[PDB]
Curated annotation (Swiss-Prot):
Protein name: DNA-directed RNA polymerase II subunit RPB2
Misc note: The binding of ribonucleoside triphosphate to the RNA polymerase II transcribing complex probably involves a two-step mechanism. The initial binding seems to occur at the entry (E) site and involves a magnesium ion coordinated by three conserved aspartate residues of the two largest RNA Pol II subunits. Present with 18700 molecules/cell in log phase SD medium.
Annotated function: DNA-dependent RNA polymerase catalyzes the transcription of DNA into RNA using the four ribonucleoside triphosphates as substrates. Second largest component of RNA polymerases II which synthesizes mRNA precursors and many functional non-coding RNAs. Proposed to contribute to the polymerase catalytic activity and forms the polymerase active center together with the largest subunit. Pol II is the central component of the basal RNA polymerase II transcription machinery.
Location(s) in or outside the cell: Nucleus
Upper lineage: Eukaryota, Fungi, Dikarya, Ascomycota, Saccharomycotina
Family per record: Belongs to the RNA polymerase beta chain family.
Source organism per UniProt: Saccharomyces cerevisiae (strain ATCC 204508 / S288c)
Domain of life: Eukaryota
Oligomeric form and interacting partners: Component of the RNA polymerase II (Pol II) complex consisting of 12 subunits.
């Protein structure tokens, strides 16, 4: 679900209003299983 990887800080849940006001991107993390 949309999260914020903010410098010198934790990754926390990003809601549309915050994204709108702090000029961030309402986007979520993409993860895949890598086989080797």
């Amino acid at each position: 679900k949309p999260m914020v990887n903010e410098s010198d800080g934790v990754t926390h849940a990003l809601y549309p209003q915050e994204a709108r006001l702090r000029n961030l991107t309402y986007s979520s993390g993409l993860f895949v299983d890598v086989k080797k």
